[PDB]
Amino acid sequence: SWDGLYLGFGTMGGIIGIRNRALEQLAEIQRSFPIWCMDWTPITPDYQNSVLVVGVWEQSIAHYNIQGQQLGSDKKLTYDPIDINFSTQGEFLLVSGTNNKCTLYTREGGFLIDVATKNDWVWNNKLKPVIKEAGSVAVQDQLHVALTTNDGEISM
């Protein structure tokens, strides 16, 4: 977690565990599909609450609280997700997986654009963090993504 207090892990058997820095069973949730990608929502002055975003292999993306109670979103997907990355300040979400496409979404779940279609599985896609000065003025329209595929291409 971005607060440095919590830790989240997933298992191919469907078990997702949330622990503290002392590695104790703070929360356990059992599913029926393998767990591949998880991340923690970045801290934000508007939200100031951290939740676990986990993409299951049953074509679904789930939001889990600290206590383990699901937020009830359970947004469905056409393709099985593989990797999940949150942009800085928690504004965007880069999703990759099946269909060989790297897509962008809002934190709510609204589709915006598709970055690239390689014609193979994209194992890992990453976003470029930005550093904002005290009171700086800039449009910051530019975004940078790095993709790694199965055949052996690392594209920018």
Partner: protein, 381 residues
């Protein structure tokens, strides 16, 4: 006069009469068909495609050469520029519902794994003196054999029976082509209807056998007659006579007029070789078929099965993949075979993709998710 000169086998004066017809009627069909036949006679495989494309460029419609080019592109799995050609020919066709253009469109749609629109176009194009026999044969083949496979499969059963109104439509087409089409084709096609009619009569097969025996007595060369006889003897549990007929079919040299039936016979012969341990002659027949055709469906499936049985997984996987591409994402058994081959070849990503698509298509396959999908999923990482 053109028919007489075609029978006399002299190209020069027949071409002269065709030119006279062209000067008389620009919309003549028999003259164009005869010109295409003579062009095939003068050039077959060296540079026939180039001259045919040139003549198609010169004359807008040129329906006979267009049909021959469609057949060639089906033989060369290149249907994309075929559909571009039919579009560019239709743009300046004046009238959309010309018999030649409708027949070409129906043939193209039949060769593109789509029976409904092909049947509609063939029915529309039947309203003419020419192309009637070929179009009727095409619709009845579609009605009897939708997936374009061997009529009798020695693996299991072999006959295919679908509802009852298909037989009624076949009977209507037979009673149309008995007054429109020829007589020998009528006998052969009625024999096919009787053989595939099942236990509806219990007497159609024997009268068809008598008719075919009379035909062979009168004419022992007519390929559909012996093909129907071999099919019927497969039906009647005959073993020695059936292989004797298929063997004597093999000895005949390749005739341009009756190639397709020959191929079919070869396929049947190939099946007779795959039912027994003699895989060498089976692969010989399969390689001959793949030499003479590049869009066969069952032949490549059998080749992939043989290679998989001979634990050569790369070539078997390639053949199964090409067969799956031929029948576009509709078959399920060969999809499972391809998934198993990919799993055994340590290509888990492709196997997972195949399993995902086959599960999306058919949700009633509990055998496939626990057998190969789970194993590949666990073997990914």
């Amino acid at each position: 006069e053109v028919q007489m000169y075609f029978k006399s086998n002299q190209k020069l004066e027949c071409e002269n009469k065709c030119n006279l017809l062209l000067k008389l009627n620009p919309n003549n069909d028999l003259a164009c068909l005869t010109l295409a036949e003579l062009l095939l006679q003068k050039d077959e495989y060296s540079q026939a495609i180039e001259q045919f494309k040139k003549i198609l460029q010169d004359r807008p419609n040129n329906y006979g050469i267009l049909a021959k080019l469609i057949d060639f592109f089906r033989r060369s799995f290149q249907i994309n520029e075929a559909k571009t050609y039919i579009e560019r020919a239709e743009k300046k066709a004046t009238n959309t519902n010309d018999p030649g253009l409708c027949y070409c469109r129906g043939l193209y749609h039949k060769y593109n794994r789509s029976p409904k629109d092909a049947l509609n176009e063939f029915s529309k194009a039947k309203k003419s003196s020419q192309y009637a026999e070929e179009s009727l044969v095409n619709m009845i083949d579609i009605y009897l054999n939708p997936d374009q496979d061997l009529y009798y499969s020695n693996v299991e059963e072999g006959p295919k029976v679908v509802d009852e109104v298909n037989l009624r439509a076949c009977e209507s087409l037979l009673r149309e082509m008995q007054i429109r089409a020829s007589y020998l084709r009528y006998i052969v096609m009625e024999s096919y209807v009787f053989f595939l009619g099942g236990p509806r009569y219990k007497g159609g097969l024997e009268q068809g056998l008598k008719n075919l025996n009379d035909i062979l007595k009168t004419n022992n060369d007519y390929i559909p007659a012996m093909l129907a006889l071999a099919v019927g003897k497969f039906i009647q549990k005959k073993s020695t006579d059936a292989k004797n007929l298929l063997k004597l079919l093999w000895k005949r040299q390749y005739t341009t007029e009756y190639g397709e039936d020959l191929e079919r016979a070869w396929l049947l012969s190939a099946d007779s070789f795959i039912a027994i341990q003699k895989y060498d002659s089976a692969e010989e027949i399969l390689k001959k078929c793949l030499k003479y055709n590049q869009s066969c469906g069952k032949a490549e499936e059998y080749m992939g099965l043989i290679k998989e049985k001979e634990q050569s997984y790369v070539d078997a996987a390639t053949h199964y993949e090409k067969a799956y591409k031929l029948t576009n994402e509709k078959s399920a058994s060969i999809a499972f075979r391809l998934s198993f081959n990919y799993l055994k070849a340590k290509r888990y990503v492709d196997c997972i993709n195949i399993c995902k698509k086959i599960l999306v298509l058919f949700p009633n396959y509990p055998k496939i998710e626990k057998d190969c999908l789970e194993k590949a999923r666990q073997a990914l990482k």
